[PDB]
Design a protein around this ligand. Structure first.
Ligand code: HEC
Ligand code: HEC
Ligand code: HEC
Ligand code: HEC
Ligand SMILES: [Ca+2]
Ligand SMILES: [Ca+2]
Ligand code: NA
Ligand code: NA
Ligand code: NA
Lengths: 131, 354, 376, 125, 376, 357
């Protein structure tokens, strides 16, 4: 609850904004609108675009690549809003930037933001800008 | 047993006695110095390979054998996606099943039948000792057991660490031994955030233990015919390569034009590219994907020909959901990708990167 | 008392530990069941709105449905579909209006029909569940129109088409009783039965006037379509019950929800959906509190539960929150749903003990309407 | 602040929910989004429809008829939300019913609710 | 002491007492003036949004404009119109997407143009003021497109038509300098200068690379189109200033808004519109607080004011609230506007002293963007 | 003076010597037993009145003089709305300017000129005495003065409480001496929340001290020609009654077909209705308004004729913003409005309601 203090990742509640995988999430946790940690809620369209962050898992002390993906085509869920920015870079480095509505490649051209999933796709490396 | 089987396969692999005129081994086309691909120039250049008879060209590019042993056996998964197998169209279930097919293929090694394969094995006293110690006395006098044993030896040889050493720079970087350069890290970041990772990664999420940069699926990415390879194969200009659908047992027309996602390991040194070796340059192969994303004139044009890529050999079942990503790769991301892809070169081929 | 979010974390950590792969994808909502509850948020008259689909047993949001301006939700009682009548405009809250009905698959939540209503005919009002209503067979949706005069619109959901407007007397609300019949409540203190075909002047019959002009019947009566029971509180907690099951209106005896002492001490009903009716238990639930007579839309902190037949008080629950709307699941051992518009929270209660069981918060901006299917 | 206590009118602040004329307002006070006590904000469209109430004016001891009118064609303001229901009757007595979006007659067929004004139209009777 | 609402009550009581009649009507907003401030509410990615038109002097909302999904507000510096690029969908957040530019009359708030943008070419991103930009003549609106590649859309406000898309390199943001040229910031760390005619590829020139890869330039630079001053903070409170006022980019001394020991004790810029530039005072205001290095989007409770020429700190205010965004009026003795996303409240400060004068609460759901006109 | 001037007007008002053939006084057409309207049947029924010649018919219905003294003098307010005046087209500025016109109108009392009017006033020793006392010796010898003094006297008389007594039930209810019947109170409620109030209330907001149920504005409500009256008046089949545009000095074509909102005081007793007496029944006048709102075909049909209301005489400048309220008056609400409007009847004409009812 100290918004400016360093982010303290936990591995014990995915609905809280301090969940380790949410380290560069921007929006809403899909698990709170009928999705899950890595799946979109019913009715929404999963984008193929992603932004990535290297997130620290406090449990095994390892850093994992989270390629965030947006669930699109619904108005914003309004539940479990979260904004973290671990390693988050400005828009000209879009691969690490999280204000972008990453809805590209979503079915039906869905481009509205509903929530974001936090799946792992690698074990960092690393990055240069953020280890 | 396991060493000794593989050592037998190692003999067989380089033995031109397994070809009709005794002019060709597996190693002729899967040359170990060329990540087990064919350095030999033919009528269609390096797009396709020439057989034992010196005339017959194939209609597909000879693939690397590196890392082919990590491909699961052919199967349809619970989502109804076909995965694994050997050959570009998965028509062989696994390596063992694949190994005898060059031997008997008249446009490759051209042995007439298993018996003639066995007779050549009997000519060599070393084989009679090698095969008998592993599979028992008289194995070479029985064509079926002889040919299956040769096939098993070959498969076992391909499964050795020599073929899949995981000693690319990418491997060393993932073990924390080394760092990617900026450009290679950019390339990697792009690779895992863009559409490539949708097909050229083992897993949908989590971390693979022996990543080979393919999900082993079948996709039609809409490639054109390699006119000069197709001319050279002699299959005719009426011919359509239906990819997975040519596997016996696959009847679903949704599979026409789909080919196995190749491992991108050693891709930098195994040109030309795609199942028909239509693209000589790696950069070209990357650029091809922009044809689905880029609105720019330069995206309709194959930079190697200056002419339009060409219509898909198979215009249906394109993986448009994955390929129409909504984002085109600019030159810097193409550079980045080429760089990253070169990191997947096994150690022993790093000298080939020029 | 391990939470949703905690169990998920645990499960995810285990899949990473075990190297378990899974395809990111679009979830299906779990099958509709008796404990599924829908909360509509009219969002205090906002141009766009949200419905939250909730697993009341788990206290979990299992889906959401977007809507327009003051949409009217309906839920097929048998769980086969949900729908709404909604309104959008070409430029947010201005420009061309389009009223439409969407029907949605209740597990994929995908629209299976989108049916334009011509000439922007919906009644725009703080959401009254019984101003848009499904016939019992699910094949027709009936929507109220106030302007230029009271009328009712008929929408064929099977053929996915608007049918016609019906001219009605000076009446309000739409309680369907048959594929072609509904009742309304009239200004004159009667109910109006309206029987309608594909064409012709509808057959309209009025009951006897059942309340005096100074007894005020609330805008959110409870109607069980399956029981044909219309439970209609007045401002004082006097509860009119009307049995429509025979297809015609029979007036049941009136019950008081509050006692004479309670009334003399200022107890009156109040909120939005003030009343709920549990069909199988034949039980009325009524949101009540001490209040001045003109604070009838304020929240209430107490639910009286009374036997519909006798008027006997069965419980008085102290809800522990400011509740505007109640409803109940229609299964055995029902949940008593207590929606706070001010807290934007559905409190889920045991309807027998009144005990709060769990809660689902962050339900929009001004959530007011709870809908359950009566699937039994 | 006790929501259930008898409403107590004042004649000292029009942006407050206990302002005397707001005794049956439901929505938003237009004065808080650029209109005024009896005028609509720019860009909105003034309904001709109204509902009434008799609201006691503690300045003068007299009760006046307030015929509320909606300012329409904009999404809801979101400022100074209020809901009072003095003498408010259910929808079947619509002239005293305040959940209805009383936007009829508004120019350009505007029917979205933005806010409400509270003009006096007579003395009670 | 007497508030707006109080004064209005006394006026209304006097009118009633005097028997003064007055016609209920649509008010005109006060003429646009220096102290008009616009607050845009992207509403945490809601499909529809609100802009508030505020008279900063009285701290009074004087009107509102509705918007769609993540619209880009632009306010003509001469007060003659406002416009946005917006995005709507045929079913709230789903269906056919229309991108469009609306131009509004700044006193009636009526739309005077609605220009459709073909092929839904807008960049959907948390709102960055300089992702859509007016040319100095007010005749042309330029908007950034990200997909399939960086591009810039040219919209003729005079003809009320979309003209065409310009191919640019790997660059971001749009800072128009002339009727036919604008700058963008490139991945490689140059600015690009883009001059377009009516036809053909535009002519593109790159400056020197001006920052290293590991110096991160925020998404919200302050740009004064009239002063040609591009003010571009990095994450550490380092500030580039770029002068574009001659048609080509010239780089002013990079300045540091924080001190080494502040940095060392954890001070960094933080929020949304982290920076304001007051043109006539040549003065930069930077939102800052003690924060971890990756908490760069959190609210700050301090603004430091520094001379743009010298880099000297002129003031450090304790805002007394969590502030996400700042801007300033461009007149003499400017207001410093401090917008709290959290509080949904625009705090209006004397920019000189930093004291809080007045505030305007209830500004939507998650207001983030303050725009003012530069009318001088 | 004030008493005495009024008392002179009283005498003139009922004096038929102010008509050419001495058949007609003000009171003939503005009959005090009928709330100062014309009970006499002519060739278009009671729609239009017959002059002193026995043959000439007007083209407009004779309006009440009750409450006409509350109407402001004719003016353009700051919103560009014209207001007040006398006659249905506001062509007279006020009562005094109005009062001479019937005297000299060959269609009405038909005196040839002011001189003939003065010669009549001189034949009467009580007028010599009454006029001289208030206006001075010789007043009756000067036709301009005598005519102006007669108008003044007549305007004074119309300003007396006798014309505007405010003793209608509505007035008693508003004082708290009685209550409305429940139908009347609903009528009152509808009146004040529907579109009637946008035109038939003195003020836009606040409370009028002496409500006469008109804003004194000019509105084209899209009335058809009253064919029978138009026939009787002889003005021709191609004649268009341009309403306010006919007032000399109004040229704005936007004023074509707009007429002065009448006071709805004594409306129950002063039928037929509208400027051309086209509707005989009060309920019909109310139902006319549903033409702009109701989607029911019946709403386009004049219940008195069973035929469409008809094309407006003047199809432009209709008050569509106020008229097209989007809400239709059901019959309960029309009945209620009738009941309410009947409360606007002055105490002395209450007995006339029995027949109307
Ligand atoms: C004359 C050239 C040539 C010779 C000799 C040859 N190959 Fe091949 N190899 C190919 C071509 C061409 C393909 C792809 C064929 C296709 O997809 O239909 C191929 C494919 C394969 C594959 C499948 C790889 C993959 O990823 O799908 C394996 C394994 C293989 N060869 C092993 C061998 C072995 C073992 C021998 C010796 C018995 C051999 N090859 C001899 C040309 C040859
Ligand atoms: C839709 C699945 C899919 C996606 C997305 C995709 N690929 Fe491929 N790629 C394939 C398939 C299948 C082939 C073999 C196609 C053939 O020969 O018919 C292939 C071939 C290649 C080859 C040739 C390798 C060889 O041995 O010949 C390269 C290089 C390659 N892809 C790189 C990429 C890059 C880089 C990306 C992202 C820009 C990408 N791919 C995206 C499926 C995909
Ligand atoms: C032949 C019948 C007739 C006689 C006699 C007549 N009136 Fe009229 N009165 C009318 C008609 C018809 C109108 C409306 C004419 C019009 O609008 O052009 C009228 C209108 C008026 C009006 C304006 C009322 C309004 O609300 O606009 C006044 C005042 C008036 N009369 C007073 C008098 C006085 C005073 C006398 C006697 C000097 C008089 N009238 C004699 C028929 C008559
Ligand atoms: C747009 C302004 C307007 C509105 C709204 C309007 N009126 Fe009128 N009304 C008039 C005007 C003007 C006249 C005279 C029209 C004429 O004769 O040309 C009139 C005439 C009448 C008359 C005839 C009076 C007479 O002396 O002949 C009655 C009765 C009446 N109105 C009732 C109502 C009622 C009841 C409503 C509400 C349903 C209503 N009006 C709404 C403007 C309006
Ligand atoms: Ca190759
Ligand atoms: Ca009349
Ligand atoms: Na097959
Ligand atoms: Na007639
Ligand atoms: Na004129």
């Amino acid at each position: 609850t100290d918004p400016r203090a360093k982010w303290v990742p936990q591995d014990n509640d995915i609905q809280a904004c301090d969940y380790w995988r949410h380290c560069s999430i921007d929006g809403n946790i899909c698990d709170c609108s009928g999705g899950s940690l890595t799946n979109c809620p019913p009715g929404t369209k999963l984008a193929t675009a992603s932004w990535v962050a290297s997130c620290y898992n406090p449990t095994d002390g390892q850093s994992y690549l989270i390629a965030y993906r947006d669930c699109c085509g619904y108005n914003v869920s309004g539940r479990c809003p979260c904004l973290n920015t671990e390693g988050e870079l400005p828009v000209y480095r879009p691969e690490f930037a999280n204000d972008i509505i990453w809805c590209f490649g979503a079915e039906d051209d869905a481009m509205t933001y509903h929530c974001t999933i936090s799946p792992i796709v690698g074990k960092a490396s690393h990055h240069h800008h953020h280890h | 047993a396991d060493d000794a089987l593989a050592a037998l396969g190692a003999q067989l692999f380089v033995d031109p006695a397994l070809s009709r005129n005794a002019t060709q081994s597996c190693a002729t086309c899967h040359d170990p110095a060329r990540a087990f691909t064919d350095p030999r120039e033919g009528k269609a250049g390096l797009a396709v390979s020439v057989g034992d008879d010196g005339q017959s060209h194939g209609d597909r590019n000879t693939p690397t054998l590196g890392y082919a042993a990590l491909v699961p056996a052919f199967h349809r998964d619970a989502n109804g996606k076909y995965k694994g197998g050997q050959f570009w169209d998965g028509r062989a279930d696994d390596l063992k099943q694949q190994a005898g097919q060059p031997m008997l293929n008249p446009v490759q090694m051209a042995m007439p039948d298993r018996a003639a394969v066995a007779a050549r094995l009997r000519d060599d006293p070393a084989y009679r000792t090698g095969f008998e110690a592993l599979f028992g006395k008289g194995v070479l006098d029985d064509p079926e057991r002889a040919f299956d044993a040769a096939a098993e030896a070959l498969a076992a040889y391909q499964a050795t660490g020599e073929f899949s050493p995981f000693d690319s720079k990418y491997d060393r970087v993932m073990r924390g031994e080394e760092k990617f350069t900026p450009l290679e890290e950019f390339g990697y970041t792009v690779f895992i955030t863009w559409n490539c990772r949708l097909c050229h990664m083992q897993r949908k999420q989590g971390v693979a233990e022996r990543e080979t940069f393919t999900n082993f699926e079948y996709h039609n990415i809409g490639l054109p015919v390699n006119e000069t390879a197709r001319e050279a194969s002699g299959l005719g200009a009426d011919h359509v390569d239906h990819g997975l659908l040519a596997r016996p047992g696959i009847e679903d027309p949704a599979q026409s034009g789909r080919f196995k996602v190749p491992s991108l390991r050693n891709v930098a040194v195994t040109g030309p590219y795609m199942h028909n070796g239509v693209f000589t340059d790696l950069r070209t192969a990357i650029l091809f994907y922009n044809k689905y994303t880029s609105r720019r004139p330069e995206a309709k044009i194959n930079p190697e020909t200056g002419a339009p890529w060409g219509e898909p050999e198979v215009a249906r079942n394109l993986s448009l959901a994955e390929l129409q990503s909504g984002l085109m790769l600019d030159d810097g991301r193409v550079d980045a990708l080429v760089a990253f892809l070169e990191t997947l070169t096994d150690r022993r081929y790093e000298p080939l990167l020029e | 008392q391990e939470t949703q979010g905690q169990a998920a974390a645990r499960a995810a950590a285990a899949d990473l530990a075990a190297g378990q792969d899974d395809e990111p994808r679009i979830l299906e909502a779990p099958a509709p069941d008796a404990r599924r509850v829908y909360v509509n948020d009219p969002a205090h008259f906002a141009a766009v709105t949200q419905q939250f689909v909730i697993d009341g047993e788990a206290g979990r949001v299992i889906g959401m449905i977007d809507g327009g301006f003051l949409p009217n939700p309906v839920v097929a009682d048998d769980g086969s579909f949900i729908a709404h009548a909604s309104t959008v405009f070409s430029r947010i809250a201005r420009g061309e209006r389009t009223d439409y009905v969407e029907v949605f698959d209740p597990v994929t939540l995908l629209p299976t029909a989108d049916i334009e209503l011509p000439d922007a005919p919906r009644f725009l009002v703080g959401t009254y569940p019984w101003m848009t209503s499904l016939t019992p067979d699910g094949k027709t949706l009936l929507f109220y129109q106030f302007s230029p005069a009271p009328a009712v619109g008929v929408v064929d959901l099977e053929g996915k088409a608007f049918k016609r407007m019906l001219d009605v007397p000076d009446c309000y609300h739409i309680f369907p009783t048959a594929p072609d019949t509904f009742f309304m409540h009239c200004r004159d203190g009667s109910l109006a039965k309206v029987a309608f075909g594909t064409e012709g002047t509808p057959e309209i019959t009025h009951t006897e006037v059942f309340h005096p002009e100074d007894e005020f019947l609330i805008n959110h009566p409870a109607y069980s379509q399956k029981a044909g029971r219309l439970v209609w509180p007045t401002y004082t907690g006097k509860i009119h019950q009307i049995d429509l099951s025979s297809g015609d209106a029979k007036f049941l005896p009136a019950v008081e929800a509050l006692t004479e002492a309670e009334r003399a001490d200022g107890w009156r009903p109040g909120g939005w959906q003030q009343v709920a009716y549990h069909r199988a238990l034949d039980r009325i639930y009524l949101l009540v509190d001490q209040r001045d007579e003109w604070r009838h839309k304020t929240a209430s902190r107490f639910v009286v539960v009374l036997d519909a037949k006798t008027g006997e008080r069965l419980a008085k629950f102290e809800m522990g929150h400011e509740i505007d709307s109640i409803n109940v699941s229609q299964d055995e051992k029902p949940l008593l749903y207590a929606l706070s518009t001010g807290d934007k929270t559905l409190y889920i209660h045991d309807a027998e003990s009144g005990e709060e069981l769990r809660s689902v918060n962050q339900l929009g901006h001004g959530p007011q309407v709870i809908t359950t299917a009566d699937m039994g």
